[model samples]
Target chain A: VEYSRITKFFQEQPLEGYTLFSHRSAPNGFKVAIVLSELGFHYNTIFLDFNLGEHRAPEFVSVNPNARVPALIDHGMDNLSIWESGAILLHLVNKYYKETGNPLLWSDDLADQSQINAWLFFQTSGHAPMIGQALHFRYFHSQKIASAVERYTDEVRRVYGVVEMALAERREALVMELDSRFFDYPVWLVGDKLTIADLAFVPWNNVVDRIGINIKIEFPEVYKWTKHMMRRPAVIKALRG
Target chain B: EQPLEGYTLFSHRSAPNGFKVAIVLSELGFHYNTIFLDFNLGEHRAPEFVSVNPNARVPALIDHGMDNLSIWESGAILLHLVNKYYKETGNPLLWSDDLADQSQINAWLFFQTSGHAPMIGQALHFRYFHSQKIASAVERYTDEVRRVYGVVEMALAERREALVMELDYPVWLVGDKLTIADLAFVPWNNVVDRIGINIKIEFPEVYKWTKHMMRRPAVIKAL
Candidate 1:
């Protein structure tokens, strides 16, 4: 649970453009803007008041027919309107970081690319919402369905275990091991440094930390790697804004 | 059976794509076998089916002891049957015998695989299964539905007959001449429509087209 270099700057881009949006107090919208800020990309934000059902309204669909918030327009291009957060972060990396020599996305090799995508899929399809189910039943649901939290948190931990094992066996792993050459490694973020693969993870791990899931005791390598990764400036900027 | 024989399907009439095959067979007047793959009895994932389609998915076809093909994917099977037996040319659903038209039809076919299936799964999970803790799940999938529906609407807006290829897009539902895409969609559409999401409110054009597609002789007759 130490702050790292890249986390801080990921939120700076959207903050500069004031692209930070919120839906009531749900705050899922801020997740992406924070990433944009970290990467330092300029973009606009439209705060959607979900309480009023402004999201389901017709006008919103003109920009994103799904009528969801945290949609990215990439203003420079007209037709490449990307919406889903998974897809949105994917766009942000190439559009902003690839050219500025931003090592935000590690470009080390193909195996790294595969590792990044494989875990990104797990985050979207596996970890984030499983943790969500834990929160839902553990805290929000009317019935106090203990099984929901139990089942999902278990699954989330297992996923963390898979990542932990990967790091223990793999090279350079997440961040610089402090004695490496430009930190060449198989860190899920790809290449040598931070990427969108790490972006999807930080928000959910933040939830995991908040939920006090005992991750460090269960899987110390994963906890250690997460601590090191979050300690980056880009991650803090992306996450905190 | 027309020329190619042993075109067997283990169709349980209740299943959507099974019904499509049944309806298509009836329209084409072919008496293929009906070994019921009962859903309630868990017959689908049974070892017997593992030979036919290893993944336990339904509505697959086999040219057992007949043609040289054994295909698992439903769209692929339907296209093979329609092309091989029905008409090599002027298949009204396919629009024309042209190469571009056939390829365009396949584009929509694959689009439905990822887009439509996800929406249906979400509907079942959220509404019927009572697994609504899936806030991310619902948002993830219904957003998919909206995207595909928009394309359908856009296709309608772009074309006079509301199609991408031929005179209109393939008859995904039952039309003047039935097509597999229609067979593929309406069974799933039942869930979407029953939920009262008001797709019509945003996509009146698709709503109108869907209503037309739904009201088909083969569709009602097969059911």
Candidate 2:
């Protein structure tokens, strides 16, 4: 009820700039918030409390026809709309910041961006789903009968081991003191040295970080990466919620 | 109708998926026209696209030689085009030379579909579709990404440039000399820059191998 009232208020007032409707902890919204903060873009949030199922409201439905979170509506009545977190992030980077100019994350001379994109897809397409299946297998055992928890849990650990391997090679592992919090340290996602890829990494890790998991102890590199990210100003601001 | 003289493909403008087919086309030295799909506007799902691919995903290959040979779906399309046209060429990606190498080639395709692809898809889900009720999507799926990485890592650990060590004397995907496997897998890795799924931080060997692949001019052009 309060959310709806607030929704009505925002609708009536007609805020003058772009508005981002989101579930604060939703999948890709964290990236948006962090990026917006980094870009210094002052934005409004819809704060859909999924626990109450407010996301399905008529107005919210009208805004995001997909009925999915992390959706955005352009500020002006032009009402330019976009969805799909990757596309949105790419759109923003291209529109606002000049993060990756590469068409597929590859530039004219170097294809490091493609490798970066490959890693990105590896996460978006590979890491996110497999780990999700692992979680689903563990948490939703009653629902998922095809795969066992042990299989996925071990799989998760193997993936962690890989991160550990990545970290093992580094001295700082990840982290720098620039941008205070959001845009510092590490290569990709860890502390800063920000990019869309790092943005993709931080929020997901935020979930684990909030849960008090540590990869740095066993996998110090990942741990280092996490701490480096946790220290990011954008992340610090994102966590201000 | 008679098969046409050559082939052409309309592909996504980016990496791995499109690059795989392009790589094979390049490796074969076969001249093929390439059209890039702008995924932002849902172009892949366009009407013209529906004509080429009802599923609307790309790397749609039209064999000019064959009067009516068109294939979509990356794996199936790649396999169809490569086998029908290139099997006679004695290429590295080509099998049927050695029975064992040939079977292994099929196994590689299966890996892309079954293991590598699923993990890659999950990674995309985390990066893009990310739902609130479904946070932790990346970490959740990344483990398998790494596990597959581990599988590839082990394969790379044993070989110099390829996953298999027998054919074409060691190389990339499907045993040496950059086959459709490299073509198949390169673009997804390219997406990592946009989505930020760092394997270098996790699996350095795979990271190194992945970087090695970036050095190719053909890979660079398509990427």
Candidate 3:
């Protein structure tokens, strides 16, 4: 019942046309799935069995030569396959959502869109990879290497600090100084309204605590923001799996 | 080239990402002053620069020309330049109206940022920056670099064979023109030899592509 209130707007919406190729448990996979659910676009799901090397199969590799999950074949686009979760999200918004209706997910303004792109790139290059390596060295490596663990964990901490500082600057006062003409208190990654950039961090932030980093204790700003994000209907659904 | 007003690039030539931006700026004929930050002295992390990029990384660009836009992240910078400067001009090298083609370009750009750059970065850090060298770490990233290079080689070869009848092979990563996708890899891959991986022998197609890009007037000037 706690998350049910959030879902009235999301789960009830109709799906359109998309076929998301993903692994059920991968965070990057969830990033695209959550966005699809949020947009209320009807799409088919094709889950790749990584344990069986299904993702590496010739058929799957034809869809994504990188052999990565979260690739998408938009049924509406004549079976066009696009890989890379970041690229997939960008394509979806640009093609289907940008400025068509509510401008919440993206903005027509050049500056706002550019800022959102910056955050998206940062999440891909810095946040996702660093934490991924930390988890790999911490849990999956055959023999644990202390230096590798320290490096990635320390790097993840630094990335959290970077995000914290960026989020902290979005206070009502500072946002006013950035552009006095704007009246609303801008707190989200790009602007006052939530966008795909904020959602991009969802899958990763969902696991920060699990990574043994004390997000609530060490990074209060990120903790607060993550909590706020967790309350969203699409976010709640995305986190379920 | 005359410098454009109100567009300053906070850059350091030695930084791979900064070098990528510079090359793109040259190719696009955008004139801007280069404000090189002192990377060795941690100038990028200083309070003044940190105010610009909380990440405190170089290649942060401020374009007052575009409503005082201060954009960081090399991949984002490249995309912004394409949208702001080249989108209206019908720059085939930046983007195409064909959604599929554009999406493919975006994938390559992200692949560089997500796959190529990070592995090369770690290899460099492990080999040179770390105080004590860990053989396994160095080998791990170095092998990864080779693996990614192989991926690019396969891609280029396949694209070449497919387009050989009408278009020249190995021209670029996207379409027949040199797009942001190919330029994104130049700065880092150019120095793989120094990073202790020889692309020349290991990945001949990638080596050929790198050399071809190096000879471009813009890339030459940026170098």
RMSD (CA, angstroms), candidate 3: 6.4
Kindly report which residue stretches of model 3 are placed more than 4 angstroms away from their true locations once superposed.
A1-16, A98-101, A172-186, B1-6, B165-169
Candidate 3 chain A weakest ten by summed lDDT: A1-10
Candidate 2 chain A: worst-modelled 10 consecutive residues by lDDT: A103-112
**Of the candidates numbered 2 and 3, which has the greater TM-score value?**
3
TM-score of each: 0.51, 0.46, 0.90
Report lDDT (Cα) of residue A187, candidate 3.
62
TM-score of every candidate's chain A: 0.72, 0.70, 0.84
- For B135-164, candidate 3 gives per-residue lDDT tens digits of 877888888888888778888887777777
Pairs that collide, model 3: A15-A41, A15-A42, A16-A41, A16-A42
Per-residue CA lDDT of candidate 3, range A118-155, in tens? 88999999989998888887888767688888898999
Instruction: For model 1, report DockQ.
Output: 0.05
Error of 2 at B3 (Å): 28
Worst 10 residues of 1 chain A by lDDT: A1-10
Write one digit per residue (lDDT tens) for candidate 1, span B143-223. Answer: 667677776676556453545445323333222333454455656655565444566787876676667656766556666
| lDDT string, candidate 2, A120-195, tens digits | 4434544454455666755664444333444445555555564455444333433332223532235443222446
Please state the Cα-based DockQ of model 2 relative to the true two-chain complex. 0.04
Tens-digit lDDT string for candidate 2 (B1-223): 5335777787765535666777767655677777787899898777766655544566677766665455554565555556555445655344345433433454445355545667666566656764432335565556556666666665556565334533423345444545565556666665654445677786666676667777877666654
